[PDB]
Amino acid sequence: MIREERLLKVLRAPHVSEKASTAMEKSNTIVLKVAKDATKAEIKAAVQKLFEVEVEVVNTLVVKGKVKRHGQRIGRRSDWKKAYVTLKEGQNLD
Amino acid sequence: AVVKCKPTSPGRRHVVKVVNPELHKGKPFAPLLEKNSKSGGRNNNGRITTRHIGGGHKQAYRIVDFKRNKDGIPAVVERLEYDPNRSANIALVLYKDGERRYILAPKGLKAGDQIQSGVDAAIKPGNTLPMRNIPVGSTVHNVEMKPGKGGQLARSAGTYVQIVARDGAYVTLRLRSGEMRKVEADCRATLGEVGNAEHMLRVLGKAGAARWRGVRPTVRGTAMNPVDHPHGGGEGRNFGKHPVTPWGVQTKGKKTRSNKRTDKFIVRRRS
Amino acid sequence: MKRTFQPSVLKRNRSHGFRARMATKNGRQVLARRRAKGRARLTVSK
RNA sequence: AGGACCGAACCGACUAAUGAAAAAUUAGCGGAUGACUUGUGGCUGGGGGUGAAAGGCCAAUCAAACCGGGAGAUAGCU
RNA sequence: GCUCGCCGGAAGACCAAGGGUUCCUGUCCAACGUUAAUCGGGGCAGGGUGAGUCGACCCCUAAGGCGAGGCCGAAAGGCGUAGUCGAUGGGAAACAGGUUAAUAUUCCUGUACUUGGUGUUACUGCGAAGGGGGGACGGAGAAGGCUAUGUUGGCCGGGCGACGGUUGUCCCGGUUUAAGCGUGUAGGCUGGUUUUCCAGGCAAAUCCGGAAAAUCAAGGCUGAGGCGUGAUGACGAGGCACUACGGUGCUGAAGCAACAAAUGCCCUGCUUCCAGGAAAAGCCUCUAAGCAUCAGGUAACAUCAAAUCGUACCCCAAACCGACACGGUGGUCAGGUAGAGAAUACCAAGGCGCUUGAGAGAACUCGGGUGAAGGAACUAGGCAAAAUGGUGCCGUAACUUCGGGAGAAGGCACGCUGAUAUGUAGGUGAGGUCCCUCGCGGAUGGAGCUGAAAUCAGUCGAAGAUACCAGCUGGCUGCAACUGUUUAUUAAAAACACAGCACUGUGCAAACACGAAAGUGGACGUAUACGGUGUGACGCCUCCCGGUGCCGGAAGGUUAAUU
């Protein structure tokens, strides 16, 4: 049982990319940016409540931040957690 | 028996094996085993405290019974076994009550021989009893110095002690060194000589053998530079000084016993 | 030719890392000194 | 069987000629089941360690490591 | 794109360590790249790392670390008990195919497995900080059984030749398929089952150990591979539709047999040797306190569960350690022909041509090739080159510690073809036939397959161990017995070490060593042991105690604090 408030905080965004699109189309799997602390179960819960859609399974991974250079000064982008969430057969997501 | 090995290579030429067939060809009694890791002759500070120790073969520790307290229960000798931890051979015995122990194998002992500890026990080889009960003139081994402690004198492959006298609460032992020593007469002792008496006839026959026995090589002080040893330095081979340890103390002759607490027990020093 | 530095992360950490430094008084002192100096990377710790 | 033999890997470094290289090259050379070799981790600390002993080795530094301090040592010398 | 060349026990493929975006795409060429650069590991932007079963975490411990109390220490702190950490070791579980520009045992497809809860019905002794078993272990050697893998034939598809021949004993390609589940084999280990008692296993034990007694000779454990299923599937040479020339979608034959065969597996086995070969948990089992008709245990079945972190890419290197796009770096994989071979040569798969080129064809330098006659005259020195170089057989001195010396030396044979023998000796081994406690069984049988070595006869060349590969040999002699070790980076030796020898200390709270100490090493050793010193295999051997040391003595002389 995850708290409503917690759930709302978990899910950061949808991730747009070719791969993501492919996943959505073929495998019925949505690619989300989620909180770095968000566990799989929590993510699933969030998905179910907040998008109103049955979840088969969630795979997560941590994306490491790229090191960049703004002019002369070096600086690193933040790490962030990506989640492939596979929706059950016949579940169409808006 | 001793066996001079045929010189099919140098390093085998001068080898003499001591091959006893009556030893157990097999894995030892595992309950009585325990771990025994190597020091490298280095103490808790991590410094080398005794030179020339290092390496050699992994060895288990056989838990030998030197206290020898199963009084009245007769044991029977199951087998003789190789112990890597000592010059003697050990013997796995089986008490009538079902317990097993390792003991130093004495001279005549073999599989099937019955042995017994206690005041009542028969004065025969391998039997153990207090030195007040043991007849004067007898050869004993595995001799306790303090009653109850465990055998400390005469444990090595072909050693034994003579009980020369029993004067009241003490008995006088003629130790293998030639030292005559008073010992409390209630101290325990095992009848006969300890076993593996042709141990001294073995000759390693190569450098490697020594190494296998965990003995690193020994450099001569005279081969060193003066900063290292008192004997060091000299152009060519010089040695114009009285022999001494690496720490400058005389080596040829200078006595080093300082124990004034046990001077009373020493009847006569060895010669 | 086998050069002197042959990196190993665990070894580095155990040797020089924060916790090691903390463990002893001299280590602590070193840390303090570093802090005083204004070091950004107080220890080898990543 | 063997600190046995011939010989690749592997470990070494006797001869030779020759910066890519703050010790290498190519051609040969020694050991190659052992007192062998190697990975990972551990321990020994500076008049201290370790040393099959050459004053060798202890982070390209060693008849006393490196870093900071006494310290602007002292310099009848340049 | 087509040729050419190089690596191929790597200059290929996959990891660890280390790095940390170098990966992929688009875009830009100032700088960086030893030249140019449209290219890049460079700049900028975007994308990319998907796990119950791989690894970490986790449970367990080794060396070692920390260490409540504690012992010790001016202070700081040292050592260490209980404990708790610490992998490089032990501990549950996944395979095949398909897919991305870039991930995959992680996605998808198929087919699996694991150990937890929870609930069940069925049963009914459960229970640990304790007991026992197990885990649990060395070197070498030898086979035998296997597979990986390869070769040939069969089969299936395609081919009929740019130049003489090529419808055949011809040519090219393919002929692949897992874990799991079932079977429990080659083979290895052990005698089982029941009963009774017992000073043992810190207490108890129905467990282990020990005694008896009965009865049956098969009982159990282990075990590669094969076979079956998994699989009416998947993959499949290439054909066929579309084409953003990148590829996408459909489709799909055969898919067998024999022989050879590992250094891999059975094997943590067996045999043997002495130098005598981790630990703890998981796992099995036994009970105690306990609880007692409850919990807990095992039984299947249902359901839920398996979080977290790593996953790109380089990894013998242009990405790690070397200031560089410059030598070092642990593991795994190991095709063909020749060969003893992981050597060597040429090749496969795959990967590269080393980020300045173009000419010229002087001296001189480097790295190679050949050389008349002579053959060490060179030189400090045959330094360097040259030479020797294989298998089999014959043959082989002094001296010797009887092992050696010895590959001593020195010689002969060596290709191809045919025959012996349309392929032998051997190896393997199908049908058939017989037996049978029935199976992965035993006999007999020899088809097919594979296949040396030799002899005889012929034959070609200047030359048959034809290339690469691959000892130079002998004689006298110093030193060190020997194998070893050593000055990282001018010294590898006659130096150090060595087995052996001798002296000497040391009676165990050992001498000695590291420690203001506690303590630790010596050693869980005990004089056949340990320390120190010298000598240095083996053989034959090996006067002086005045000096300096050490050992013993203590009559006298001298002699401190103290008084």
Side-chain angles (χ1 to χ4, degrees):
Chain A
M1 222 300 122
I2 304 82
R3 195 149 156 202
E4 290 181 298
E5 176 165 315
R6 180 43 202 279
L7 283 180
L8 290 147
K9 290 182 172 188
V10 160
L11 293 177
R12 289 293 94 182
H15 185 57
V16 316
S17 157
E18 190 193 65
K19 178 169 188 181
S21 304
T22 304
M24 245 211 267
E25 100 178 26
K26 275 188 200 191
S27 302
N28 203 345
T29 296
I30 47 174
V31 186
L32 311 155
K33 193 185 291 315
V34 305
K36 202 174 189 302
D37 93 302
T39 187
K40 268 172 184 174
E42 276 180 344
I43 284 160
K44 174 166 155 181
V47 166
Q48 278 182 350
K49 199 193 172 210
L50 273 48
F51 292 65
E52 296 122 38
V53 66
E54 287 185 309
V55 169
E56 194 166 11
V57 64
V58 179
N59 284 207
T60 55
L61 64 78
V62 176
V63 181
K64 311 305 183 283
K66 284 183 176 173
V67 171
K68 295 280 169 172
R69 293 182 62 78
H70 190 86
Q72 282 182 320
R73 215 175 272 121
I74 198 173
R76 195 151 177 288
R77 292 158 175 218
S78 285
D79 294 11
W80 63 273
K81 201 165 185 173
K82 194 170 172 171
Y84 294 92
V85 184
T86 307
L87 307 164
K88 289 190 191 176
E89 60 186 309
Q91 284 293 354
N92 198 69
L93 224 199
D94 64 320
Chain B
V2 302
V3 182
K4 182 91 188 168
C5 295
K6 294 196 164 191
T8 52
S9 48
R12 212 75 162 76
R13 172 168 255 116
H14 301 294
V15 173
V16 169
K17 295 178 155 186
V18 168
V19 176
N20 186 20
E22 303 262 61
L23 291 189
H24 180 54
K25 292 179 175 177
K27 301 296 173 190
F29 194 64
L32 284 173
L33 295 187
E34 92 167 47
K35 183 182 125 225
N36 177 46
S37 183
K38 297 177 167 293
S39 156
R42 292 158 160 84
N43 72 341
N44 61 13
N45 290 338
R47 302 290 194 73
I48 285 167
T49 53
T50 159
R51 283 111 54 74
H52 318 324
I53 301 177
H57 203 290
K58 184 137 67 181
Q59 296 168 329
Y61 185 67
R62 316 307 194 271
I63 292 160
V64 167
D65 168 27
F66 299 104
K67 269 218 279 188
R68 193 70 188 286
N69 311 322
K70 282 266 189 198
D71 300 346
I73 306 154
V76 53
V77 175
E78 293 215 292
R79 63 191 189 210
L80 310 185
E81 272 191 34
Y82 181 88
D83 189 357
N85 295 282
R86 54 182 86 267
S87 75
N89 277 129
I90 63 180
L92 184 62
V93 320
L94 181 52
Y95 287 93
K96 259 57 178 177
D97 66 0
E99 187 165 330
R100 318 193 148 69
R101 269 125 172 264
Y102 284 131
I103 69 175
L104 268 34
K107 199 174 161 185
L109 202 81
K110 57 193 179 188
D113 287 32
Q114 276 210 47
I115 63 176
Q116 197 162 37
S117 29
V119 165
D120 65 324
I123 297 150
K124 94 178 236 309
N127 286 36
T128 297
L129 42 141
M131 281 181 290
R132 57 179 52 265
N133 301 128
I134 289 167
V136 171
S138 61
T139 54
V140 242
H141 69 293
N142 190 60
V143 185
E144 295 191 330
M145 289 166 132
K146 284 190 169 190
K149 197 163 169 181
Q152 281 185 282
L153 313 153
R155 273 124 123 281
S156 201
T159 59
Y160 62 94
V161 194
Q162 273 156 247
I163 306 189
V164 302
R166 162 158 69 252
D167 51 307
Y170 288 83
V171 307
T172 303
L173 284 314
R174 204 202 294 283
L175 299 199
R176 202 71 183 73
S177 56
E179 184 145 319
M180 286 266 217
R181 198 192 195 284
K182 244 140 183 160
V183 161
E184 291 172 48
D186 254 301
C187 294
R188 225 145 181 89
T190 307
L191 272 305
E193 270 150 295
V194 96
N196 185 25
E198 66 182 343
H199 164 83
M200 63 174 169
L201 280 348
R202 88 199 344 293
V203 32
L204 274 15
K206 57 164 189 183
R211 297 314 301 270
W212 298 337
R213 293 144 166 91
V215 177
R216 299 197 75 248
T218 301
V219 180
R220 305 174 343 270
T222 194
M224 306 182 168
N225 294 312
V227 75
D228 313 310
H229 200 280
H231 291 174
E235 291 281 293
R237 306 197 173 99
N238 298 343
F239 189 74
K241 33 235 170 184
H242 303 109
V244 280
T245 56
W247 309 283
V249 181
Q250 189 84 24
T251 50
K252 300 282 174 43
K254 190 215 195 303
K255 295 171 165 68
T256 75
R257 161 167 247 253
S258 183
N259 197 230
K260 220 138 61 174
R261 174 182 89 259
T262 64
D263 271 326
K264 69 191 165 217
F265 300 137
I266 311 318
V267 172
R268 211 202 314 99
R269 301 280 290 158
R270 61 123 215 301
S271 294
Chain C
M1 305 182 68
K2 191 187 187 191
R3 285 280 126 78
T4 52
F5 186 61
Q6 295 285 331
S8 182
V9 174
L10 168 75
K11 219 186 282 190
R12 157 152 273 223
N13 279 331
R14 282 185 176 175
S15 186
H16 304 305
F18 177 83
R19 295 202 87 250
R21 288 275 141 88
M22 234 50 197
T24 177
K25 183 268 289 181
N26 283 310
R28 274 198 290 290
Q29 275 193 330
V30 155
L31 283 203
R33 271 215 301 286
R34 285 184 83 75
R35 280 219 183 75
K37 185 128 167 167
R39 288 303 184 172
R41 291 76 138 285
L42 204 269
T43 43
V44 183
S45 276
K46 296 265 286 182

PDB file of all heavy atoms in Angstrom, chain C residues 15-38:
ATOM      1  N   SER C  15      43.164   2.078   1.653  1.00  0.00           N
ATOM      2  CA  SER C  15      44.389   2.836   1.957  1.00  0.00           C
ATOM      3  C   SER C  15      44.100   4.258   2.394  1.00  0.00           C
ATOM      4  O   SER C  15      44.577   4.707   3.446  1.00  0.00           O
ATOM      5  CB  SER C  15      45.286   2.874   0.757  1.00  0.00           C
ATOM      6  OG  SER C  15      46.522   3.483   1.080  1.00  0.00           O
ATOM      7  N   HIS C  16      43.430   5.005   1.528  1.00  0.00           N
ATOM      8  CA  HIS C  16      43.418   6.458   1.603  1.00  0.00           C
ATOM      9  C   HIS C  16      42.062   7.076   1.807  1.00  0.00           C
ATOM     10  O   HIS C  16      41.960   8.290   1.989  1.00  0.00           O
ATOM     11  CB  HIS C  16      43.948   7.026   0.289  1.00  0.00           C
ATOM     12  CG  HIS C  16      45.297   6.536  -0.082  1.00  0.00           C
ATOM     13  ND1 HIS C  16      46.385   6.649   0.752  1.00  0.00           N
ATOM     14  CD2 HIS C  16      45.737   5.904  -1.192  1.00  0.00           C
ATOM     15  CE1 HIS C  16      47.442   6.127   0.165  1.00  0.00           C
ATOM     16  NE2 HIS C  16      47.075   5.658  -1.014  1.00  0.00           N
ATOM     17  N   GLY C  17      41.016   6.279   1.757  1.00  0.00           N
ATOM     18  CA  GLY C  17      39.671   6.808   1.690  1.00  0.00           C
ATOM     19  C   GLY C  17      39.222   7.413   2.992  1.00  0.00           C
ATOM     20  O   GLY C  17      39.961   7.434   3.970  1.00  0.00           O
ATOM     21  N   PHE C  18      37.988   7.882   2.996  1.00  0.00           N
ATOM     22  CA  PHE C  18      37.504   8.735   4.059  1.00  0.00           C
ATOM     23  C   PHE C  18      37.492   7.972   5.379  1.00  0.00           C
ATOM     24  O   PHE C  18      37.892   8.492   6.426  1.00  0.00           O
ATOM     25  CB  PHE C  18      36.092   9.204   3.732  1.00  0.00           C
ATOM     26  CG  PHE C  18      35.474  10.032   4.813  1.00  0.00           C
ATOM     27  CD1 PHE C  18      35.759  11.389   4.900  1.00  0.00           C
ATOM     28  CD2 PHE C  18      34.625   9.457   5.748  1.00  0.00           C
ATOM     29  CE1 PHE C  18      35.196  12.163   5.896  1.00  0.00           C
ATOM     30  CE2 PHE C  18      34.073  10.220   6.750  1.00  0.00           C
ATOM     31  CZ  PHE C  18      34.355  11.578   6.820  1.00  0.00           C
ATOM     32  N   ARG C  19      36.918   6.780   5.305  1.00  0.00           N
ATOM     33  CA  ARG C  19      36.698   5.988   6.497  1.00  0.00           C
ATOM     34  C   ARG C  19      38.006   5.633   7.176  1.00  0.00           C
ATOM     35  O   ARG C  19      38.103   5.739   8.409  1.00  0.00           O
ATOM     36  CB  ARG C  19      35.849   4.764   6.196  1.00  0.00           C
ATOM     37  CG  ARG C  19      34.450   5.117   5.760  1.00  0.00           C
ATOM     38  CD  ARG C  19      33.484   3.978   5.977  1.00  0.00           C
ATOM     39  NE  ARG C  19      32.939   4.036   7.329  1.00  0.00           N
ATOM     40  CZ  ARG C  19      33.213   3.186   8.311  1.00  0.00           C
ATOM     41  NH1 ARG C  19      34.035   2.157   8.144  1.00  0.00           N
ATOM     42  NH2 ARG C  19      32.630   3.355   9.492  1.00  0.00           N
ATOM     43  N   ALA C  20      38.993   5.272   6.363  1.00  0.00           N
ATOM     44  CA  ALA C  20      40.342   4.959   6.851  1.00  0.00           C
ATOM     45  C   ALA C  20      40.924   6.141   7.613  1.00  0.00           C
ATOM     46  O   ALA C  20      41.472   5.991   8.716  1.00  0.00           O
ATOM     47  CB  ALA C  20      41.238   4.634   5.689  1.00  0.00           C
ATOM     48  N   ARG C  21      40.778   7.302   6.993  1.00  0.00           N
ATOM     49  CA  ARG C  21      41.262   8.573   7.558  1.00  0.00           C
ATOM     50  C   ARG C  21      40.630   8.820   8.920  1.00  0.00           C
ATOM     51  O   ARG C  21      41.314   9.174   9.887  1.00  0.00           O
ATOM     52  CB  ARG C  21      40.901   9.701   6.633  1.00  0.00           C
ATOM     53  CG  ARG C  21      41.741   9.702   5.365  1.00  0.00           C
ATOM     54  CD  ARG C  21      43.058  10.420   5.604  1.00  0.00           C
ATOM     55  NE  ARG C  21      44.193   9.776   4.934  1.00  0.00           N
ATOM     56  CZ  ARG C  21      44.602  10.018   3.692  1.00  0.00           C
ATOM     57  NH1 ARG C  21      43.982  10.893   2.898  1.00  0.00           N
ATOM     58  NH2 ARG C  21      45.655   9.361   3.234  1.00  0.00           N
ATOM     59  N   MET C  22      39.327   8.618   8.956  1.00  0.00           N
ATOM     60  CA  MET C  22      38.522   8.811  10.163  1.00  0.00           C
ATOM     61  C   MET C  22      39.023   7.903  11.271  1.00  0.00           C
ATOM     62  O   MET C  22      39.025   8.319  12.419  1.00  0.00           O
ATOM     63  CB  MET C  22      37.084   8.446   9.888  1.00  0.00           C
ATOM     64  CG  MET C  22      36.100   9.533  10.240  1.00  0.00           C
ATOM     65  SD  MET C  22      36.572  11.115   9.549  1.00  0.00           S
ATOM     66  CE  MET C  22      35.546  12.172  10.566  1.00  0.00           C
ATOM     67  N   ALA C  23      39.279   6.651  10.910  1.00  0.00           N
ATOM     68  CA  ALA C  23      39.612   5.601  11.845  1.00  0.00           C
ATOM     69  C   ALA C  23      40.698   5.973  12.828  1.00  0.00           C
ATOM     70  O   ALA C  23      40.543   5.755  14.037  1.00  0.00           O
ATOM     71  CB  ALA C  23      39.990   4.343  11.082  1.00  0.00           C
ATOM     72  N   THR C  24      41.763   6.602  12.340  1.00  0.00           N
ATOM     73  CA  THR C  24      42.875   7.040  13.206  1.00  0.00           C
ATOM     74  C   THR C  24      42.894   8.543  13.515  1.00  0.00           C
ATOM     75  O   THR C  24      42.233   9.333  12.859  1.00  0.00           O
ATOM     76  CB  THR C  24      44.239   6.553  12.659  1.00  0.00           C
ATOM     77  OG1 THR C  24      45.300   7.051  13.492  1.00  0.00           O
ATOM     78  CG2 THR C  24      44.484   7.006  11.196  1.00  0.00           C
ATOM     79  N   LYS C  25      43.668   8.905  14.535  1.00  0.00           N
ATOM     80  CA  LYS C  25      43.791  10.283  14.999  1.00  0.00           C
ATOM     81  C   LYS C  25      44.561  11.106  13.968  1.00  0.00           C
ATOM     82  O   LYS C  25      44.166  12.236  13.623  1.00  0.00           O
ATOM     83  CB  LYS C  25      44.587  10.306  16.298  1.00  0.00           C
ATOM     84  CG  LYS C  25      44.743  11.675  16.962  1.00  0.00           C
ATOM     85  CD  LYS C  25      46.018  12.432  16.555  1.00  0.00           C
ATOM     86  CE  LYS C  25      47.299  11.820  17.120  1.00  0.00           C
ATOM     87  NZ  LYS C  25      48.517  12.589  16.722  1.00  0.00           N
ATOM     88  N   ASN C  26      45.657  10.539  13.498  1.00  0.00           N
ATOM     89  CA  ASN C  26      46.484  11.223  12.497  1.00  0.00           C
ATOM     90  C   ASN C  26      45.703  11.454  11.219  1.00  0.00           C
ATOM     91  O   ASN C  26      45.796  12.548  10.655  1.00  0.00           O
ATOM     92  CB  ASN C  26      47.804  10.490  12.310  1.00  0.00           C
ATOM     93  CG  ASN C  26      48.785  10.773  13.440  1.00  0.00           C
ATOM     94  OD1 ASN C  26      49.029  11.931  13.794  1.00  0.00           O
ATOM     95  ND2 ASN C  26      49.351   9.718  14.018  1.00  0.00           N
ATOM     96  N   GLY C  27      44.925  10.463  10.818  1.00  0.00           N
ATOM     97  CA  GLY C  27      44.058  10.562   9.640  1.00  0.00           C
ATOM     98  C   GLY C  27      43.090  11.732   9.787  1.00  0.00           C
ATOM     99  O   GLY C  27      42.903  12.532   8.867  1.00  0.00           O
ATOM    100  N   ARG C  28      42.489  11.791  10.961  1.00  0.00           N
ATOM    101  CA  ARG C  28      41.531  12.851  11.319  1.00  0.00           C
ATOM    102  C   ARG C  28      42.180  14.215  11.184  1.00  0.00           C
ATOM    103  O   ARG C  28      41.603  15.146  10.626  1.00  0.00           O
ATOM    104  CB  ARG C  28      41.060  12.646  12.734  1.00  0.00           C
ATOM    105  CG  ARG C  28      39.867  11.684  12.798  1.00  0.00           C
ATOM    106  CD  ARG C  28      39.083  11.766  14.107  1.00  0.00           C
ATOM    107  NE  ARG C  28      39.805  11.244  15.270  1.00  0.00           N
ATOM    108  CZ  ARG C  28      40.096   9.955  15.503  1.00  0.00           C
ATOM    109  NH1 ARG C  28      39.703   8.986  14.677  1.00  0.00           N
ATOM    110  NH2 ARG C  28      40.777   9.624  16.604  1.00  0.00           N
ATOM    111  N   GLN C  29      43.372  14.302  11.735  1.00  0.00           N
ATOM    112  CA  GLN C  29      44.188  15.532  11.712  1.00  0.00           C
ATOM    113  C   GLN C  29      44.422  15.972  10.275  1.00  0.00           C
ATOM    114  O   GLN C  29      44.266  17.160   9.977  1.00  0.00           O
ATOM    115  CB  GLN C  29      45.511  15.287  12.384  1.00  0.00           C
ATOM    116  CG  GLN C  29      45.472  15.449  13.894  1.00  0.00           C
ATOM    117  CD  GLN C  29      46.860  15.518  14.504  1.00  0.00           C
ATOM    118  OE1 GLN C  29      47.818  14.931  13.988  1.00  0.00           O
ATOM    119  NE2 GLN C  29      46.979  16.244  15.615  1.00  0.00           N
ATOM    120  N   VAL C  30      44.783  15.017   9.435  1.00  0.00           N
ATOM    121  CA  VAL C  30      45.033  15.260   8.018  1.00  0.00           C
ATOM    122  C   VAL C  30      43.800  15.886   7.353  1.00  0.00           C
ATOM    123  O   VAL C  30      43.893  16.884   6.615  1.00  0.00           O
ATOM    124  CB  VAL C  30      45.348  13.964   7.300  1.00  0.00           C
ATOM    125  CG1 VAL C  30      45.017  14.030   5.806  1.00  0.00           C
ATOM    126  CG2 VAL C  30      46.796  13.553   7.515  1.00  0.00           C
ATOM    127  N   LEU C  31      42.669  15.260   7.644  1.00  0.00           N
ATOM    128  CA  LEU C  31      41.371  15.685   7.120  1.00  0.00           C
ATOM    129  C   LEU C  31      41.086  17.132   7.521  1.00  0.00           C
ATOM    130  O   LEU C  31      40.672  17.959   6.691  1.00  0.00           O
ATOM    131  CB  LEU C  31      40.274  14.811   7.683  1.00  0.00           C
ATOM    132  CG  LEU C  31      39.964  13.393   7.216  1.00  0.00           C
ATOM    133  CD1 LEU C  31      38.520  13.092   7.572  1.00  0.00           C
ATOM    134  CD2 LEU C  31      40.179  13.116   5.735  1.00  0.00           C
ATOM    135  N   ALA C  32      41.327  17.398   8.795  1.00  0.00           N
ATOM    136  CA  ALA C  32      41.125  18.722   9.388  1.00  0.00           C
ATOM    137  C   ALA C  32      41.963  19.758   8.652  1.00  0.00           C
ATOM    138  O   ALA C  32      41.471  20.840   8.300  1.00  0.00           O
ATOM    139  CB  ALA C  32      41.531  18.698  10.839  1.00  0.00           C
ATOM    140  N   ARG C  33      43.213  19.396   8.445  1.00  0.00           N
ATOM    141  CA  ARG C  33      44.193  20.249   7.752  1.00  0.00           C
ATOM    142  C   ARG C  33      43.686  20.596   6.361  1.00  0.00           C
ATOM    143  O   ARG C  33      43.726  21.761   5.934  1.00  0.00           O
ATOM    144  CB  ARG C  33      45.510  19.516   7.611  1.00  0.00           C
ATOM    145  CG  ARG C  33      46.506  19.646   8.740  1.00  0.00           C
ATOM    146  CD  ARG C  33      47.914  19.646   8.168  1.00  0.00           C
ATOM    147  NE  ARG C  33      48.225  18.437   7.413  1.00  0.00           N
ATOM    148  CZ  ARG C  33      48.463  17.244   7.940  1.00  0.00           C
ATOM    149  NH1 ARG C  33      48.471  17.046   9.255  1.00  0.00           N
ATOM    150  NH2 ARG C  33      48.744  16.230   7.137  1.00  0.00           N
ATOM    151  N   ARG C  34      43.220  19.556   5.671  1.00  0.00           N
ATOM    152  CA  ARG C  34      42.688  19.680   4.313  1.00  0.00           C
ATOM    153  C   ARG C  34      41.528  20.665   4.288  1.00  0.00           C
ATOM    154  O   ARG C  34      41.458  21.549   3.419  1.00  0.00           O
ATOM    155  CB  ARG C  34      42.281  18.352   3.795  1.00  0.00           C
ATOM    156  CG  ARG C  34      43.526  17.572   3.435  1.00  0.00           C
ATOM    157  CD  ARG C  34      43.185  16.244   2.811  1.00  0.00           C
ATOM    158  NE  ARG C  34      42.910  16.443   1.393  1.00  0.00           N
ATOM    159  CZ  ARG C  34      43.827  16.665   0.458  1.00  0.00           C
ATOM    160  NH1 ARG C  34      45.116  16.701   0.754  1.00  0.00           N
ATOM    161  NH2 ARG C  34      43.429  16.847  -0.795  1.00  0.00           N
ATOM    162  N   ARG C  35      40.640  20.486   5.253  1.00  0.00           N
ATOM    163  CA  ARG C  35      39.454  21.334   5.416  1.00  0.00           C
ATOM    164  C   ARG C  35      39.861  22.792   5.577  1.00  0.00           C
ATOM    165  O   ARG C  35      39.295  23.689   4.934  1.00  0.00           O
ATOM    166  CB  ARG C  35      38.678  20.908   6.634  1.00  0.00           C
ATOM    167  CG  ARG C  35      37.794  19.692   6.400  1.00  0.00           C
ATOM    168  CD  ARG C  35      36.457  19.819   7.115  1.00  0.00           C
ATOM    169  NE  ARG C  35      35.646  18.620   6.956  1.00  0.00           N
ATOM    170  CZ  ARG C  35      35.858  17.466   7.582  1.00  0.00           C
ATOM    171  NH1 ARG C  35      36.844  17.336   8.474  1.00  0.00           N
ATOM    172  NH2 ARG C  35      35.052  16.437   7.337  1.00  0.00           N
ATOM    173  N   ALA C  36      40.838  22.986   6.444  1.00  0.00           N
ATOM    174  CA  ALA C  36      41.387  24.316   6.745  1.00  0.00           C
ATOM    175  C   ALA C  36      41.905  24.973   5.474  1.00  0.00           C
ATOM    176  O   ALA C  36      41.619  26.149   5.199  1.00  0.00           O
ATOM    177  CB  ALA C  36      42.519  24.191   7.728  1.00  0.00           C
ATOM    178  N   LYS C  37      42.657  24.181   4.726  1.00  0.00           N
ATOM    179  CA  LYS C  37      43.249  24.616   3.453  1.00  0.00           C
ATOM    180  C   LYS C  37      42.157  25.091   2.494  1.00  0.00           C
ATOM    181  O   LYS C  37      42.278  26.143   1.869  1.00  0.00           O
ATOM    182  CB  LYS C  37      44.012  23.473   2.830  1.00  0.00           C
ATOM    183  CG  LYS C  37      44.753  23.888   1.561  1.00  0.00           C
ATOM    184  CD  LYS C  37      46.227  23.516   1.559  1.00  0.00           C
ATOM    185  CE  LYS C  37      46.815  23.664   0.158  1.00  0.00           C
ATOM    186  NZ  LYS C  37      48.300  23.632   0.084  1.00  0.00           N
ATOM    187  N   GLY C  38      41.056  24.356   2.458  1.00  0.00           N
ATOM    188  CA  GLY C  38      39.949  24.663   1.577  1.00  0.00           C
ATOM    189  C   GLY C  38      39.794  23.689   0.432  1.00  0.00           C
ATOM    190  O   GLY C  38      39.056  23.960  -0.514  1.00  0.00           O
TER     191      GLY C  38
END
